Symmetry: C5
Subunit: 310 residues, 5 copies
């Protein structure tokens, strides 16, 4: 018959979310409650009713007593799991109380940058039983699982936390227990507003101010240099994310500014070609279209992405 | 009844404060004094009154003697704690004298960048008893706790150090002991004065010198390029800090220079529009306002932030 | 006679492919099935038919019983192999069932950047028997080997996976068993299209728009600055790859743009030399060749590489 | 009575000096000679007079024999000390001969950048006895201590090495032994001459050549851009050092170039203001002062720092 | 009498050569054959003639039998040596067969950048006996030592490999054995040709094309900006190497381009001073010298370094 293994997982800290490598790092405490009647013991008066063991000697005790422990794996773990505490408290009953304090990076494969920077992501930790459900069954340890209140993450803001149990078939033919700690987090846009939106909007607006100078050559030089600035911002954005196989809302936004700037060069080349061909009065009358086109093109572009993505 | 566990924590070095990840790194010595009568021993003349043990065999001795040690955790620890020394000296009495020399990173969740770079921060180390206050009670080991005098930190300057004891309820129903080593540190502004204030002030002042040339086109080209420089400084600042969800005094300072520079372009576009419309004498009379506006705008801006943040 | 050792290797995650260092990193599970009759045991009613061991005590048991285990090496491994699980399940029969969960970097020496970014690469993991084929023979553990479905790699896309067995002669005179897990992966071009093709094409096209201004000096200044931009892109590409001893399709592409831009400067220097020597009407008639040359040169260049590499 | 512990420390390599973090890294061999009569032994003919032990079993032997070993700490150590060798050779006499080969980072708190890059620094390694001078006294192991001849450091050049003994009161009431290995090193200026002095001097000299063109507008544009170059060099320098609370000779040097460049803009604005107000012949006569001012200002500045710092 | 210790070292991979830190990283296999008659054993029919041990228990066996093992050190090792395999096979004879598979960084103190990038470097691994030549003598294990055929290094190309034995006096009075694995490697120049030579040559050639425009002011602006580009390339080169105390062929090359560019500004300032002083026909006749000087100066410079370094 299968023995109930009570899994509890609590994230104390989010040491960082690395979106370029699609992983996240946490400081967490794993808690297990497992009653093994075979491990029960007798005690003399004065002698303790609860025995405390370092994982090392407790496992040496299980091998001796020929007992199978609920061997588990953190399925989505990455690299080294640096441990702080691995402590066992065994009661007279045979109730094993295990605490595992660690720092570890976990894979974040649920990363969807399609709406970046206005994106909401799913982050999870998978705890899998190596032995199937006929031997061990994971149960939800009540009053422990979740996320702490001093996570130390500044960019991300956790919207909700969930815990559930499911099956997996990793090393076995039949179903094996899997404990899931899931959390959703959205982004603080302040960085993107201050470093990307405000600068890009300023470059466009203050470049439009110079249209009132009525110098087409000057506009051509300005739009040319503006295109270079946007190419630079394009590289600034690309450095934050992985080399995705799909277009970001941010990628569409930058390509958009490229197109408009390209056309601004094209248009003012045409107006300056009119001036050069003795048609200055004509280019000056058409100039109203060039001056009002610019804000409308960018405001039409903004409504195009907003429609194409929402 | 509960046994008194004497906690002492001394920071020898500050290997660095990483404000982008909101953590700090120290080289520290943990000292514990704990009297366990069960560990007491008898000795023959000439035989030692004090037994010295490597933590490994001392824990093997506690498991044998069925004794529970005051299992503790550095609550705000991050990653690997690299150890130097883990040594035990056990007296005939049963007084355990423990020394733990380590290098480790600790979470700094108290980070408030709102007044950066004129900010004062709180840094702490939390030492928690896994077992509740009915079993073990932490006490302040006198004549040890604090910070050394060769911390090796150059940017930060520690203003004060504090030690106190409090309860926590991390793994238990009832209160459990927590030792706290806290320190406040303010920043050395020399870097920000030399690399950010002096350059930004120079760019603004020497750009104002060229107003005396009375070439509005030249001013437009200058203010346009100045805006780009400030956008570059904006990225230089952003690289030091996390992607915060709030505005910094520094962020307000840069946005301030953007606004003024934007208006400088706007104003000189207007003056040059007057010259282009045969109103050169008028633009030259108004030029006194443009020349005196510039220093007043920046000096009004400086007083605006200083009021808005202080 | 030789004992059959059943090797199974499954990659759960691709934590990253580092093309600058020509290596890749995985989270993987190694599975071994090995029947050693000497390890067989007798059991009492109620006592388990399957004994579970930590690798540490299981090896201590093999040394005691004077049994030689199939000592193996991951031939192309690099750095530290961080382990998660090292668990043994021994049946009454003497069938050893081993599971090795790890995170590790592996050498990728098959890297051929000649057609980068349109390249397809081979990645493999080599599992070698230290002892020759007369002692141990590796066999393919059926229903396990391969790659998972949540690898978490965004740039690369795995085209096919293969498993085979071969000999090696690393530490022995005679042939020794080698298990191979191979996979082919091609690249997602979206990054290169968005950050390199679109910008380079835009710079060239919008620079051509200004030819319609009929200012040869302006073209010279433009082509000169364009050359600098391409030199900058050249450095952006070089940072992704190792310092190869061969030319990339990308390197040829950039050298191509250098040559055309160099000749654009040369041509427009000539046209401006005609204007300076009182031959303005002649330079204006020849200008049709200069304006139509530019798109033809770049379109001839594109067809040259495409032929030279395909 | 106290037992003499013979300390010897030899640095084989300087893997690097990190001046931004004020630490240094070495590959070193620690050698200890300690006579403990209690550890002495008897031997049969043929049996060895010298017993060789792995630190692990030798410490297990000391715990058994209830002997206190001279527990020591590398006081200024940082992070992980990666060990190569930890070997004990025990003679029939009871003379313990210990060798500790390691790679480790050590705090460099003696860093004084005030005269950077012409600075001389002190680097040391502190070896402290955990037990006081009444139990163990450190003595200088002769014919071992110092620095090797293939340190592999290219920027720094070790001027002298010293070894001495002093007391410390880290964990004890009374004085405890401390072994000190100190070395002084000065910097190779070639990098600073080639990358900072020569470029800055060239920018200034070749900018002065253009004064002979007699175009005040051109000088204003040149000095403005030069100021930007110096701001860039300012950031190049700041990246090598920590965010110090004091001024560097280098910081003074850069601030100096800012001031002169600021005044160059101011002066040429004045000369161009004379030309604009029909005073061209006057500005041309004063131009001798502007042309001779520039070299004198920079040569007066160079003598100002040289006096202010030497 | 001394016992022969057979050393064999084979490098499977070159994980990278870090020329900034003057070290290199390898994946290697160390092989030792050592006959210790004291370790010999008796066997019954059916019982094995060869005993297989994990280094841990084999060393525990040597301490028990009071046998001294040939304790060795990798003299030029750096940091952590991550081990894969540490396996012992002991024959009835007492022949110890040891295999050590590792990943490790090693000091490269032989680095001579004087002719960089046309340099050839020496890389080695030193294996030293802690015990002198009277106890243990290292011998060359034949048919093993060298370098593999899938080293995975792309920039460097190994020219030759050598193995030899020498003495050292590190911890001993008398000579102690040292095994040396040496290899010479030269560089693949393709990176330097594509990223440094071609761009620098293009900048110079296309800047010369503009001399045919006969605008001295334009040349001054061009040479000034070219100087800035070379200063940028100067920083690009400096980032690859340590802060050496000697001049590189590359450093001389960049300083060379600075000098010529400085003189180009000087010359064209003179020609433009002639034009400004009503001597346009004279400056135009001298212009032949200015136009032919430029290619000759650079071609004289190239022959100067080539003579000064070869
Ligand atoms: C930069 C946006 C500011 C708009 C206001 C116009 C003033 C001129 C700004 O400077 C110019 O900006 C161009 C585009 O970035 C560069 O090509 C050029 O070299 C530089 O002189
Ligand atoms: C810029 C701070 C120094 C002000 C002193 C005035 C002299 C000219 C300095 O060069 C200026 O640099 C800007 C940024 O690149 C360009 O936009 C601008 O067109 C260019 O003239
Ligand atoms: C950048 C190509 C955009 C084409 C549109 C034509 C307008 C001018 C763009 O500014 C150009 O930027 C270069 C940057 O290197 C400078 O060298 C060059 O003198 C300058 O004119
Ligand atoms: C620049 C150091 C070399 C001086 C030699 C004189 C020739 C002109 C050099 O080009 C200058 O490049 C700066 C880039 O920042 C611009 O700001 C400035 O307007 C421009 O004139
Ligand atoms: C860059 C070498 C190309 C040679 C062909 C001349 C075309 C103009 C290229 O733009 C130039 O860029 C330099 C660097 O910023 C400036 O100093 C210079 O005044 C500017 O005109
Ligand atoms: Cs963080
Ligand atoms: Cs585990
Ligand atoms: Cs602990
Ligand atoms: Cs210009
Ligand atoms: Cs292994
Ligand atoms: Cs990835
Ligand atoms: Cs520091
Ligand atoms: Cs020590
Ligand atoms: Cs070095
Ligand atoms: Cs060793
Ligand atoms: Cs490599």
């Amino acid at each position: 018959e299968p023995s109930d293994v009570f899994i509890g997982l609590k994230i104390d800290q989010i040491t960082g979310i690395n979106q370029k490598e699609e992983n996240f790092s946490v400081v967490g405490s794993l808690r297990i409650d497992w009653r093994q009647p075979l491990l029960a013991f007798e005690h003399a008066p004065g002698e303790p009713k609860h025995r405390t063991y370092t994982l090392a000697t407790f496992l040496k005790l299980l091998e001796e007593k020929q007992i199978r422990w609920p061997a588990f794996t953190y399925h989505n773990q990455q690299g080294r799991m640096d441990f702080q505490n691995r402590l066992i408290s065994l009661s007279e009953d045979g109730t094993v109380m295990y605490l595992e304090r660690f720092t570890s990076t976990f894979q974040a494969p649920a990363f969807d940058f399609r709406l970046f920077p206005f994106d909401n992501q799913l982050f999870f930790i998978h705890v899998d039983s190596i032995f199937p459900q006929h031997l061990f069954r994971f149960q939800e340890m009540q009053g422990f699982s979740g996320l702490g209140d001093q996570l130390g993450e500044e960019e991300w803001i956790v919207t909700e936390v969930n815990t559930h149990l499911t099956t997996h078939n990793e090393f076995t033919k039949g179903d094996a227990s899997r404990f899931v700690l899931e959390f959703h987090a959205e982004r603080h846009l302040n960085y993107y507003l201050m470093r990307i939106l405000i600068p890009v909007l300023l470059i466009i607006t203050v470049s439009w101010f110079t249209f009132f100078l009525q110098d087409y050559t000057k506009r051509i030089d300005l739009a040319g240099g503006n295109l270079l600035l946007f190419i630079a911002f394009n590289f600034t954005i690309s450095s934050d994310l992985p080399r995705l196989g799909y277009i970001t809302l941010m990628d569409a936004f930058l390509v958009g500014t490229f197109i408009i700037t390209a056309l601004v060069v094209l248009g003012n080349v045409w107006l300056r070609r009119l001036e050069n061909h003795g048609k200055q009065a004509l280019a000056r009358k058409l100039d109203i279209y060039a001056i009002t086109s610019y804000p409308l093109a960018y405001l039409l572009g903004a409504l195009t992405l907003w429609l194409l993505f929402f």
